[PDB]
Amino acid sequence: KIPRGNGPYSVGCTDLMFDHTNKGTFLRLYYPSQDNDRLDTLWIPNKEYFWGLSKFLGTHWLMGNILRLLFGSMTTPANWNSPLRPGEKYPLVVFSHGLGAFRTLYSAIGIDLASHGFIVAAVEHRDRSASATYYFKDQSAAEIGDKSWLYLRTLKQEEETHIRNEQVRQRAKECSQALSLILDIDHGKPVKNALDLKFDMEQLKDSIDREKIAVIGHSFGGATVIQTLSEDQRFRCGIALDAWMFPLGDEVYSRIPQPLFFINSEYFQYPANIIKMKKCYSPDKERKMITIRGSVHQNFADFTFATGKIIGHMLKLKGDIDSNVAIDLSNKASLAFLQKHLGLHKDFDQWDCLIEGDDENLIPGTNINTT
Ligand SMILES: CC(C)COc1cc(=O)n(C)c(=O)n1C
Ligand SMILES: [Ca+2]
Ligand SMILES: [Cl-]
C-alpha cells in the first residue's frame, strides 16, 4: 500500500494530455478534493508501462506480464476524478520523474503534497527517458483513442554526454510548457483533453495561486529541477530528490538564482555527483542539503511500497529505514522548505528542523567525502 497523505485535505487525481502530440503536455494531476466516495486511482494504468519497465530492467519480456499480473490492478489512495475543493488558490508543484519511470510512480509524494493543499502536476516526459509513454499521431487517432507508444531509448557510451543533456533540456521545456498550460487553464482558457475523461477542467479556473510555483523531481528529474530553474524564473524554488547530476551542462551550475533543496538517499550518492551538487552552492544564494539515514535511491518512488520488507530489500526497493518513515521525512522537509520560499502561511514551519537535518534519521549535508 502506497500511504495516504498526512495533511488535512482529501486528495483527487486525474490525467491531462494537451495537445495530443508527442510535443504536447501529458501530466497526472493531484489536487485537494472535497471529501468524497469515488474509487481510488489505478496506479499503473496500461499494459505497455509494464512492458516498458521490463525493457528498462533488461529482463525477458515475460517479466513484463509477470509485473502486470502482480501490479496491474493495484491502486493509489487518490480519488479518481473527484471534484476540486473550491474557494482557495492552491500553490502548484511541477514534478519530474526519474529515468525508467513515468507520471504515475510518485503518487506517495503527489498525494501528500495535495493533502497539504498543493496542486501537483506530475509530467510524463517524451524525451525517451520514460520506460514508456504515449501520444496520438493525429486528431482522429486521438478521438478513437488509438495510442502510439514510445519506449525508453538505450544509449551508447559515445552518445551519453551529448544525449543526456538534450534530454534534460527537453525535460526542462516540458516542465515550462505544462506550467503555461496550467496557467492558461487557471485563466479559463478552454482546453480539449485528448484523453476523454469525466473531469471538468473548468473547475481549475481561478484555483492556482499564480505566483507560488515550485519544481520537484527525482533522479534525472532532480537534474530536471535545476535546468528548469535556470531556464524559467516563474518557478520560485526547487527540491531535488536524489538528483543524478550528469545530464546538466557545466554552464548551469552558476545560473540558479532560486532557492534549491537537496534531499539525498544514503546509499545512492557518490563523490562525482556530490561535487556537482556543491558547484550549485554560492554565498549570495540559498542552498540546503540533507541525507536520509539508511535510505536507497528507490525510497523516493512508489515501488518502495509495492513489495514486502524482505523482497524489497533484496531488490533495492527498500533500505534499512522504513519506507513510510523515509518518505514522511522527505515530504515534511519539502513542505517546510516550500512554506519558507513560496511564502505560505500554513503550519509547515514545524518541520524547519528537518531542513537542517536535525532528526535522528537525518544527516545534515552529506555522508560522502569530497577531498
Ligand atoms: C552514464 C549512464 C550509463 C549512467 O546511467 C545512469 C542513469 C540514471 O538514470 N541514473 C539515475 C544513474 O544513476 N545512472 C548511473
Ligand atoms: Ca524561459
Ligand atoms: Cl541506492
Ligand SMILES: [Cl-]
Ligand atoms: Cl565518484
